[PDB]
């Protein structure tokens, strides 16, 4: 239901969460902090958008408050969590998505300012990690604090959950190509603790490392162990993608893989998991809501028992319909 | 003393297989044939590159012959390759690089102008194939019309050679991320046969097929039927990456498998297969000519048996340089 | 009763003046010519647009008619524009938008299969040319075959036109940055007649040619030989901008040139010529249907008549709007 | 024998600057501060660029020292610019590159360390400011801190110099299409003081004020209040160009304007302003030293009186080698 909600941080996840509670209309945002940018500067950031384009409605600055379609939004400037009225403002339920209190004590920070529970919009090290039609089902009342997982764990998860209930999984390692991010830099500058980063992302397919193969382990038990990866940042604005190559303990024919697959969609994991026999490319996901879209067309099959299965994510769009959808299952269960 | 070259094309494969050949002073251009493109426009195309910089030499038209560094070419202008007078302007070995004359039929129109030997510089569906430091000595003077097989599969094969020989692949599937090609548009426009080929370069990350793991089972054919892939075309104008996940025969530790691909890239391999330990993004291998450099710090190790292998590759500078070494390794053996 | 269209080519002109059409429901689409595109190929490039997103409605194949939101449309597949049987499928104007035909005696071939009138989306060496807002009043019955001009001219002309009438023009110098076009090379290749427009789209900054600004003189006579300019063509893969330098007859403040254009935008150019005092960017412009939007903040005046007056157009979805426009424009005079 | 420098800051310009040195060998590099990035990381951002290639020789860390071309240099890690014991490291010159110590009073700091002269890379909004080849015979012994203006300030006067010197420049309005800075982000974010220029480099045309052309009438106090321009930042890694539009008070052809330049280019301008008319775009310009470079080609005369001149700069290389030109003319002075 209609949750009363605060977010801390109006960076690029705090503003495509806001934009998705008012475009879905499934969570009230009464509350945003930060304390690095003003309200008037917070109007233009909302109100305009180079990848998913300007705000479908109004955006204005009204006697301090930001007003999104008429609702007004009290805006606050603290730099320790601590110290957020979130209370006074009646937000409920806090989404952090500054990126730096992803820790259950460093999270929990929200609760000294009024908030009833806490949503991590980012993984967490300790905090128990949700992936909606994965394993929200264990979400439960008792559960104050809670991590979201990231952006790629949402897109393989739905992916991995089907192929292991229907072939099983023997071990896996995924590959994410990935669209640019706000970390990187435009040309070669200083990035200390992670050396190929700062080099220009513009011109260059830049390695990383990503937690999100393993942290499906978490989200899915049966696969802790048996899955890791690697990214390669590209120079693309928005929508990334996944490559699965996992060997399978039942023998798969690509037909049966595209059927089991096609079946989640249309059923249990509509609106989570897309399916698609099209010609697509990434920009074809630009906004899309789907945490993960199974491009049957892309994917291939050595043999029934080794595959590479490709599926597509706009890693900003799709993780921040999660949190909303996360915050309103939540309500539910109230 | 060195063998004497004829080049059919004078695209992108023609203009980097010539700069290669004056480059590294291993064969002598003396003729280039292109009905498309005249005189005036082959200094300009030759001696101005976006991609490797302005030719670090001389280029001139100088009665009505291309002149490189003081070498006169012939030029020719004939749509139909049995009609080219290479015998006249010298020209031995002739490099088919237009890509429409690939089978043995069409590539051996160039034996009636008189070129005793042609190379053609894409996949062929029946010519034998080669790849440099893999199958090279499987080369004999029977041969008058030979493979270079394509810049994936010289990436591909020295790796796989590696380590097939050392720990043994039982299976194999590669991910190429790759720089954008003359055969992709820059916004949305037609390409009838591969649709999603089509569609903007500039903005897009799109799937594509290839067959260059398939071909890598024809060069090492103890891999026949172990290896298979697809391709991620990026928006990068040079520099690819080739992703192998394979499970291994006999147990490898990542140290392991960095030690026999170190020593293979300084003794037999050199100067075909690099290594790395340094933080390298694909513009550091921006007109570096081997056809593989192998990333130690990107590559992740599941366990003992199942990794992920990542070697970059310049696919224009390695490929045409490969070219010139094939051409010079039958000179020798004439 | 709105005018029934035929559309002849089915490239990027083509497709948008469709998707203006039913988007803003002025015209009807009954007939597609594309000898060259198939109807299934034609529902894919209809339905995902890189640039501009998924079509907002249903496109499909329906016994061999493209049917978009539930309107069945005709589909030819004729070379030769004579043999095209428009009247049969009911096609009142047709728009010749292929780029080949813009002579009155080419695009006069379309009379012949039964159409009444013919708009060349493209600039003519002969036909009447328009531009909406500017000398439309101009058009009558007796005009069988008219020009709708160039994006650049759409976007030059109506500022031109409001500072002229209020201040005078005495000369004026045009630079667009223009976004890349299908004209353009991915990587170095051939485009023999100019040398520059081969060089790689996405590594470079392109000088060109335009004839846009001298064609400014056409529509507004006032102004012939007045006016000249050029292009540099940026890797951007939509969105330009004008950036007019011009002296002036009668003095004009800066804030009197930004008076007189948000009155045309508010009166008679309302839908033509926008205007804006916010902190755009070229994304903010992405699928606005304005011919030119002036960005008040951009331009500077070095004094009273010498003035750098900043214009921002989409050159894909403007221009496509402007011939829909011009269509309900003549169907209002018959 | 060569005067020994100092160099605060190895960002960007402090980095090309050092390449510059070494590469010219007009200056010895012997000491840099930088309080945020240690010797390991100065090895990595010194020795790979993915804009220039890899250093064109040696760089090692070694006891404690950055060693390039066997030559070592002393690395200081202070804040505090008073602080910098340049005297003891034998730094006679210092290079203020941080960009944040632009005044007098700020420049100044270093000359409490023992440095004779201190050399601002950027504009001062009081220090004497200097281009090579316009006003560097200005300069004399007695100014102890001085500024050598922007990399569009270097570009415009030494074209504005041979212009008005020939014609006469009654008035002037410029736009410079500028490459990516390492002041833009990579997708929309925070930018308080220029809400612009934190909208998404990779898709966007961004306008910008500059005060180059303002700048360039201190420089050649006769254009003083003469000249003014904007710049709009385009996703281009590299190599910007400058569009001036100017009235001639003598009026002139083309071909004498091509004269005139390509005569400067020859003499007293030679390895500052270079002269083309070659079919160049932006790529042929990377790594090109000069400050500015003429396309005679691209430039467009209305009438004898008002021309678009236009002219590219490497907005990198040919900066940081007027940097290490100013400093050899002073040493040469002393």
């Known amino acids: 239901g209609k949750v009363k909600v605060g977010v801390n941080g109006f960076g690029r996840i705090g503003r495509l969460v806001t934009r998705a509670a008012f475009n879905s209309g499934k969570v009230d945002i009464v509350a945003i902090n930060d304390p690095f ?4 500067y917070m109007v233009y950031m909302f109100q305009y958008d180079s990848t998913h384009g300007k705000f479908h409605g109004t955006v204005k600055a009204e006697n301090g408050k930001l007003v999104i379609n008429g609702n007004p939004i009290t805006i606050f400037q603290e730099r320790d969590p601590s110290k957020i009225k979130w209370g006074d403002a009646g937000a409920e339920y806090v989404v952090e998505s500054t990126g730096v209190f992803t820790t259950m ?5 929200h609760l000294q300012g009024g908030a009833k529970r806490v949503i991590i919009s980012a993984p967490s090290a ?6 909606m039609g994965v394993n929200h089902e264990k979400y439960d009342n008792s559960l104050k604090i809670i991590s979201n997982a990231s952006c790629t764990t949402n897109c393989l998860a739905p ?6 209930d229907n072939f099983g999984i023997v071990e896996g390692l995924m590959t994410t190509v990935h669209a640019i991010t706000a970390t990187q830099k435009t040309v070669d500058g200083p990035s200390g603790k992670l050396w190929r980063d700062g080099r220009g992302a513009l011109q260059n397919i830049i390695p990383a490392s990503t937690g999100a193969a393993k942290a499906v382990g978490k989200v899915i038990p049966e696969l802790n162990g048996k899955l890791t990866g690697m990214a390669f940042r590209v120079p693309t604005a928005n929508v990334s993608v996944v490559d699965l190559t996992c060997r399978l303990e039942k023998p798969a024919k690509y037909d049966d893989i595209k059927k089991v697959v096609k079946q989640a969609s249309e059923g249990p994991l509509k609106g989570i998991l897309g399916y698609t026999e099209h010609q697509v490319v990434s920009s074809d996901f630009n906004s899309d809501t789907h945490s993960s879209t199974f491009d049957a067309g892309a994917g291939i099959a050595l043999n029934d028992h080794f595959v590479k299965l490709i599926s597509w994510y706009d890693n900003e769009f799709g993780y ?3 949190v909303v959808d996360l915050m309103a299952h939540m309500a539910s269960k109230e």
Chains 1, 2, 3, 4 share one sequence.
């Not at 940018?37 to 008037?40: A, E, H, R, Y």
């Not at 004590?105 to 920070?109: P, R």
């Not at 300790?126 to 992936?131: R, S």
């Open 320 to 322: 921040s319909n999660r």
């Open 126 to 131: 300790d905090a128990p990690m949700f992936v």
């Open 159 to 164: 992916l991995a959950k089907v192929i292991h």
């Open 105 to 109: 004590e460093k999270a929990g920070a």
């Open 37 to 40: 940018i003003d309200l008037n």
